[PDB]
Structures are given as C-alpha cells and as structure tokens.
C-alpha cells in the first residue's frame, strides 16, 4: 500500500541544472507529487532539524552550510512502497543506475536525499511541511 | 540585463500523463531559473479564472477552467536572460516540433503548459500565483 | 476528431537502430497504436502498390529496392489530426526538432513514412492491413 | 553462436503509461533485433492462460489475466547473442534501479514487461505467441 | 554531394556539462567525425584568427575572451550536406528543435561554432586543423 | 582524492552512433575531460602496447584486428575516484545501468575501455597521451 516520503533536492542539482532530471527518475517509476516546496534558500534551522540526527557527526555543519548555499526543493512523493523505493532510486555514488550512481561523485554534494524509514519519513514530512 | 520573470504554470495533463519533469526539464537545459514555485493539488478555481481573466468572453472559457482544476498543477516563476519571449517558444504550439507543445502535446485543450507572453502579462499572473509580489 | 493514419518505420531505422527513437516521438506526442505488423521483409508488391503514386519517379526502383532492403514496421495511428500532426512530426532533413530534421541525412533513406492526406492515408492503410 | 531468440511481452501498463517506445528502446540499445512482432489490441485469454499456464495454481493468477487483458499488448521475438538471460537481465525486477522495470514499474503485478527466463520457456512461448513457428 | 565542416563546441559547452549533448545531436544526424582536437585553453591567435571576420565587432574582445576563458573541443565533421546542416542543427537560441534553441540563452554564450560557408569551413578547418 | 583515468572510445561505439552516448555517461557523472584524441585508425603498434598483458590470450589477434578496425577516440578523465568509478561507469554487459550493460553484448565489442588499476591508468596514459 501507499507511503509517502520526503525528497530533498539539494543545491548542487540545482548548480548543475539536474533538477528535472532527477524528479523525471522519480517521476518515470511512477511516483507522484502530494506536496512540494520551492526553497530559494532553506532556512538553517530547518535544515538543522532536518539532519538533527547528525548533529554530532564530522560533517554536521558543513553539510547545513552546503544545504544552505543555494536553493532546494522538498517533496513529498506518494507511491507503494515509496520510502524504500525512492531511497533505491537514490543510491549512491558507487551504484550506476541510481541517481547518485549516475550523476553524483562527492561524499556531501550527492544531489538528493531520501527518506530511509517510516519514521524519518514522517518526521521529515513534518518538517518540511508542518501545517499538516 | 535582459533579465525577465515569467509565469508558467504545469497543467494537470502533465501530471496525468507524468510529463512534468520532461516540461520542467527543457526550461531547465535553456538555461533558465526557477524563482519560486507552489504545488497545487487543486487549484482554486478563482485563481484560474483570474489567470484567465482575458478569456472570460470565449466559448472555451469554462471547459477550460473545468480542466484547469482537474488535476495538480505547478506554477513557476522562472527567470533568466529574454525569458518570456524565450520560455514562450519553448512552449511552442501544438504545430510546431521541437517545442514542448509541438513534441508532447496534441489538444486545443489539453496542452501541458502556460508560458506568459508579455511583460505585462507575466507580471500580472506572478502576481496572481505569488501574491506575497 | 480522431484520425487514423498510416506510418512506415523503414528499414534504415532498423540498420541505425531508431526503431524506438522514432515510435517515441509519435508516442509521446499522444498517438495510439491501432494496428501494426513487422516484416522481416517486405513482400515487393507491397511496397510498390504502396508507392504506386510514384511509379513513373526517377527514384522510383531504387526506393523499392531499399524499401525491401531490410525489416521494416507498419503502424496505424490514431489521434486527434493524426495525418497531419504525424506528417509533421516526420517532418523532412532540413526541419531541425522533426524526425528526419534530426536523424535523417538523405532523400531516400529517412527512417519514416507517413501519409499526406486523408486519402493515402485510408488507401495505405488498406494496403498494409487489408484484413479490413 | 551465443545466437538465442526469446519471447517479450510488452504488457498493458506499457500502454497506458505510453513506455512502449521506452520499453523497446532499452532492448533495441542494447543490440537486439526484432525476428517477429505482433500487436494485439486485446489479446485473447486462452493465449495469456497459456502464457502463465506455470502459475495457474498461483493466487494471483487470475488478476494477472484480467490485467493482461485490460489492453494491447506486443509480443515480441528479439533475437541477439545471449539473447534470452540479457534480456531478462534488462527487464530485471521493480527493485533494481538500472533496468526496465526498475527505473519504470512499482507493482508485483504491473510491471511493463515480460521476458523469457530459460531457452525451454522461450521455445515454448515463441510457441505460444507465433503459432506459424 | 558530400561535404567537411568545422564545430567548435565552445567553453561554456563544458561548463554546463554539455558537450556530449552537443556532439550527440551531430552524432545522431549521422554525421561523422572526420578529426578532433581538445583544447584545455585555446590559444587566444587560434581564435583570434577564427573570429577574423568579427575584429572589428564591438563584441570582439568579450567573445576572444569568452572564447579561451575554458576548454574547447575543435571537429571536423563529414557528411552529405554537412555544411549547411550543421549550421542547422547548430540553429539560434529563438527557435527550439536547435542546438542553440534547446540549450543557449546568451547572445555571446551558445554552445557551438559551425562554419557557414564553403569558404569559411575550408578557412576554418585550416586554423584548427592545419595538417590539412 | 582527485585521479586521473584513461578511456578508449572503441570502433563499436562509432560503427553504432554512441560515441556521444558513453562520453555523455561519463560528463553526466561530473568527471571533466583532460585530454582526448581522434584516431580514424590507430597505429597497431598502439593497440599492442594498450593490450599487452592480453598477448599471451587466445582472444588477442581478433581484439587488435577489431580496436583497428574503425576509428578510435582516446580520453584521459580527471576528477574524484576517477578511475574505479569510470570503470563501475563502464561495467559489463550482465548488469544494466552501465555503459556496456546497457548497450553491449558482445565479449569483444563492449564499447569502451577504462584503466582498471592506478598503475594501469599511469601506463595507458603514457601509451595514447606521450607528452606526459
Ligand atoms: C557521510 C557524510 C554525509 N554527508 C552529507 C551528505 C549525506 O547525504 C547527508 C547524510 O549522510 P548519510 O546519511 O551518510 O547519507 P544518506 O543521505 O545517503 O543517508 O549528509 C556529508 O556531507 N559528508 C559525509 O561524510
Ligand atoms: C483556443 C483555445 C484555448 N483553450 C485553452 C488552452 C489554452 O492554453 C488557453 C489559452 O488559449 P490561447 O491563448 O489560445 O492558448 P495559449 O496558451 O497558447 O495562449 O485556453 C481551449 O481550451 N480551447 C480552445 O479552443
Ligand atoms: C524525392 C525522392 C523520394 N525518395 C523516396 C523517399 C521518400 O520518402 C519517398 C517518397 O518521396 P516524397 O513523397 O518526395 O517524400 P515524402 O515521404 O516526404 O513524401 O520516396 C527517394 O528515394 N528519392 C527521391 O529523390
Ligand atoms: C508474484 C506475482 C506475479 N504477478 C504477475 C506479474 C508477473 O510478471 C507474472 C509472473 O510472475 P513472476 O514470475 O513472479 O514475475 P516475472 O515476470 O518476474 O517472472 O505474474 C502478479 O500479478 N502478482 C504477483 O504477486
Ligand atoms: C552578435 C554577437 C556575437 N557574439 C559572439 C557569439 C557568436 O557566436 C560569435 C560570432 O557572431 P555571429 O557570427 O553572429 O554568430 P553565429 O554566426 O555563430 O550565430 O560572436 C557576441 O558575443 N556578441 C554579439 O553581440
Ligand atoms: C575475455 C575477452 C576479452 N576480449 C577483448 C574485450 C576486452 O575489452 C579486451 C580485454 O579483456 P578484459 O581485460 O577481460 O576486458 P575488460 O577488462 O575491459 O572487461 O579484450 C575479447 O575480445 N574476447 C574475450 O574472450
Ligand atoms: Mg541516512
Ligand atoms: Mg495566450
Ligand atoms: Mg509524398
Ligand atoms: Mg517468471
Ligand atoms: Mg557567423
Ligand atoms: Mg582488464
């Protein structure tokens, strides 16, 4: 059955003009749009929030700082299975055939996030979209 | 310079026929911004007939509201050099291949995209989708 | 309203492998396959019945000849203005954005047919699919 | 040498969601040519219960038919070196990014795309589908 | 009758990761590729020489600049009609179907060079390809 | 760290138009051209130095007589992990989402070559690009 997730497109895909490219990857599996936002620039804490659980890692403000050097769009994706699936669809930058796979070759700058669990799904749903 | 901001709105036949990256996409490759955008799952219907406002009078009016709100659609304000004249091209018509229109869409009705097509126009219908201005 | 019309994949679309390439144009610009067979050759008559119109040309044989010279798709389409918006959408090698604007560099090997008028159109469907 | 021929279905949701050319496409990239092709606007049942005849005691058996009958379908034959595994590979599973039904389908049961999985099936499915052998 | 011609994919092609994109399209329109050449930064008299025409435009030293501010790719491309067709693939960044029209938005930032003439392309391709 | 990578753009990818297509998959993944050559036939000799650890293979003669067979572009990439993740990028033609996975089929016609291994990268370099 249905799920939701949430999607960030980050700033790098919007540098390198990947935006469409990405969303058609998650659009051609079948995946649609409920909620979407465009971002000129997040608002820091946000993003804090966002990645609250890795406030303690290496990369924690880096990564914010990244997050926040250009625009973003958040998405909520709606399909069966869609928080794992997306996820796959994301990859990572060892996996070609994944959007990371494909277009992305950095530790930090990797295009797109994705909800790992139903749990983080809908925190981060909360997030990004609060009123509701 | 010639920086303009135009208004396109993502029609809800895009995302019935899940052709709404492919459109955002080919304004993406001309090399234009987006400046904002909002995601309706409906529209309300009182925004699309003020988008329309100039077509209040013609026999298509309604049917095409009717449309307008059958479905999601996005409204984007991009930006870039020359960019309602240029993103007006790249919508194209339903004649013309190469054009967004032209490639992917085959209705009087039923055509995927608006593009504003002056000046006038896009600021009015930014003003419309974004009224925050 | 809806039109049927006739379209030929030829067979240089087989030999450069833009079978696909060629059928996703007119597929997503909206047109349906009615009917449709692929000859592993084309039985001559066929293609000469089918270009009939043609039999006092100058190229008139050599077109056969290469219109034999491989596999080749007959499609009905039906849309709406399909016979036009199709002939269009095959365009000719001069025309960038069509089909033979962008994948066709000859006179007569150029990938695709597509009948002109409402006629050829129901006189090569006739051709092509008797069997109605 | 490696020369095999084996069967494709393209299924109905191929249709619906226009991936036909899509579908195709990827084969066709890949090397394979058409040996024979037939479009069937509806197919009949009996050819699709023979089809699946190793699934009959399947719960899903008969959704799937009902599927496989809810609109065209295109059967067919590709033929190339390693032709029936490559194939199969290409349509792969919903789960893994890289193929047919991993960039494109997310159902168990509409899922684009059928190949053939052994030189037995493929035999016996050309079998099915093109009865003049 | 079948003719050479000279593409320069230009810095801002490399930029914006658009180079294959670009050499697809004359690829894809069967056009072959007769000899080639990278330039990490081309030589500011190689352009120079290639704008020649233009030495006394207003834009002539903006476009120099532009011209070596990254790497270029110089081809010479074979094919029936090459000149001409080139150019049209090349197109301008008013009409989409193009090169230029898909994918250049700036009067002096657009992607690709095609000579235009019999006399230019044998000019042209002396500059870049002097062994000839 | 920041590697460098030497890719052969094989006969096979200009007898099928896909040149662009695998250069495209590589520019995709952020990975910039350093250097690059067109080789309308490359000098057997070069061919035996690339492949010299294969000599001593049953499949020898039939690879020189093939990567000689057509032209031939040689590139040297440069960017982040380069070498192992141009290879992954190459892949083989079992698994999809790669070059060869999506367009080869052939244990000797498979599209492209990528150095395996730093010190390979460093010899193929020096074979197809001297002057360093
Ligand atoms: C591990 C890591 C992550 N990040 C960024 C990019 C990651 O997408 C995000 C969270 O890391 P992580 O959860 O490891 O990646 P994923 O998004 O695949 O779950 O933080 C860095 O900037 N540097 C790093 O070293
Ligand atoms: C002319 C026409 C327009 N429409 C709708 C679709 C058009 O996008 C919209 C405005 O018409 P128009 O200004 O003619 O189209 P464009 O979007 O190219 O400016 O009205 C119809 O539904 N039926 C019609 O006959
Ligand atoms: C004019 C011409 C056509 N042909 C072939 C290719 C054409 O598609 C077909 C019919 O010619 P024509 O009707 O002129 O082209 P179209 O298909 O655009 O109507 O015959 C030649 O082989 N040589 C020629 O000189
Ligand atoms: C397992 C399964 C299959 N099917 C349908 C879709 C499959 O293409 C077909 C055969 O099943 P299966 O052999 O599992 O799939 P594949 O096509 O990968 O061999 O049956 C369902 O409708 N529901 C199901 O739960
Ligand atoms: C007209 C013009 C050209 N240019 C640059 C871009 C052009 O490709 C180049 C030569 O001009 P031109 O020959 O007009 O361009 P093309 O014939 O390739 O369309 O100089 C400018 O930078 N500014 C300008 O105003
Ligand atoms: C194994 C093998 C390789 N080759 C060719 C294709 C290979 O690209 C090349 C070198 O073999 P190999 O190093 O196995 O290929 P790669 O490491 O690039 O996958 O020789 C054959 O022609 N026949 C064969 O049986
Ligand atoms: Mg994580
Ligand atoms: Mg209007
Ligand atoms: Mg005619
Ligand atoms: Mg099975
Ligand atoms: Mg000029
Ligand atoms: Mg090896």
Chains 1, 3, 5, 6 share one sequence.
Request: proline letters at 4%; one cysteine or more.
């Amino acid at each position: 059955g249905l799920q939701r997730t949430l999607v960030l497109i980050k700033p790098d895909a919007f540098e390198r003009s990947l935006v469409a490219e990405i969303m058609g990857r998650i659009e051609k599996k079948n995946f649609k749009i409920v909620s979407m936002k465009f971002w000129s620039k997040a608002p820091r804490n946000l993003i804090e929030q966002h990645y609250k659980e890795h406030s303690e890692q290496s990369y924690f403000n880096d990564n914010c700082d990244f997050m926040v050097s250009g625009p973003i769009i958040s998405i909520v994706y709606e399909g069966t299975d869609a928080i794992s699936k997306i996820r796959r669809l994301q990859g990572n930058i060892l996996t070609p055939g994944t959007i990371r796979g494909d277009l992305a070759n950095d530790i930090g700058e990797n295009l797109i996030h994705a909800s790992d669990s139903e749990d983080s799904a809908v925190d981060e749903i909360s997030i990004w979209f609060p009123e509701t």
